Every structure is written in structure tokens, then in C-alpha cells.
Curated annotation (Swiss-Prot):
Known function: May play a role in protein trafficking. May act as a linker molecule between the submembranous matrix on the luminal side of zymogen granule membrane (ZGM) and aggregated secretory proteins during granule formation in the TGN.
Principal subcellular localisation of the protein: secreted
Keywords linked to the UniProt accession: Cytoplasmic vesicle, Extracellular matrix, Golgi apparatus, Lectin, Protein transport, Secreted, Signal, Transport
Molecular function via GO: carbohydrate binding; peptidoglycan binding
Name the UniProt record assigns to this protein: Zymogen granule membrane protein 16
Transmembrane parts of this sequence: none
UniProt entry tagged with the keyword Membrane: no
Superkingdom of this protein's organism: Eukaryota
Limits of the Jacalin-type lectin domain: 3-138
Length: 138
């Protein structure tokens, strides 16, 4: 199998979410991360031309970054406690797309198999992002 999964990173709070179906819309083209003083509050990912359903809460400022045509995420690092605190999306164009506060238990996610990239994300959410998982594929 070429697919692999990294996670789950964070806690057991909130409720499961998965962008598993969203990969049919296209590759990841953009990121939205809502961030407050201490946490990652909310997440949205654009697959092809279509934004995912917003997950997480409302108490924070929206940060939004668009990817270049053909730009793929090849690594994701971050930090968490009871809730997700930081996220860094490392792309194959050498960009490091960083969100949130540099504190907590660190993680460092890389794809298991040859020539795979970030295809979708899952995790847990409520008023914040409780946990995140990364799904790698061709
Ligand atoms: Cl799983
Ligand atoms: Cl949209």
C-alpha cells in the first residue's frame, strides 16, 4: 500500500472529523487556520477549488495561506497539550507554513512510503482543535 497515516496527535476531547471524501475535489490548494493566544482554534482545507466544512471554534483570528500550483505538503510538524497548539506545513517548494504558538509536546510527521504527499487531514474538534492526523498518499 502507498497510503500511510501520521497521528493521532492531541487529546480525546471533541468529536471526530475527517476530510477523507474531500480528496476527490482535488489536491490541497490552500489552508485556513484559526488561532488564538494559546491554541489552534479551527481548521479549513481547500481541496482543488472547494473548501472543506469548517471545523473547530470561533474564538480566534483566521490565518489563510494559498499554495502554488503543484505545491505539495511533504512534512507536518506541530505541538499540542490537551489541544493542538502549533502546526508547520513543509512543502516541496521549500516553504514552511507555520501557525500558532511554539509550546507543548512536539510531533514530526513524515510520509511512510515513496513519493507520497499530504492528501487529507482528520482529527478531533469542538470549540478548538483537540487532535490532528495526517493522511499521506500518491
Ligand atoms: Cl485510522
Ligand atoms: Cl469553496
Amino acid at each position: 500500500r502507498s497510503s500511510s497515516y501520521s497521528g493521532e496527535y492531541g487529546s480525546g476531547g471533541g468529536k471526530r472529523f475527517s476530510h477523507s471524501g474531500n480528496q476527490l475535489d482535488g489536491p490541497i490548494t490552500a489552508l485556513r487556520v484559526r488561532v488564538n493566544t494559546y491554541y489552534i482554534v479551527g481548521l479549513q482545507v481547500r481541496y482543488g477549488k472547494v473548501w472543506s466544512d469548517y471545523v473547530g471554534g470561533r474564538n480566534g483570528d483566521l490565518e489563510e495561506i494559498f499554495l502554488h500550483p503543484g505545491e505539495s505538503v511533504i512534512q507536518v510538524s506541530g505541538k499540542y497539550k490537551w489541544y493542538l497548539k502549533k502546526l508547520v506545513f513543509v512543502t516541496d517548494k521549500g516553504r514552511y507554513l507555520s501557525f500558532g504558538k511554539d509550546s507543548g509536546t512536539s510531533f514530526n510527521a513524515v510520509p511512510l512510503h515513496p513519493n507520497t504527499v499530504l492528501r487529507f487531514i482528520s482529527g478531533r474538534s469542538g470549540s478548538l482543535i483537540d487532535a490532528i492526523g495526517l493522511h499521506w498518499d500518491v
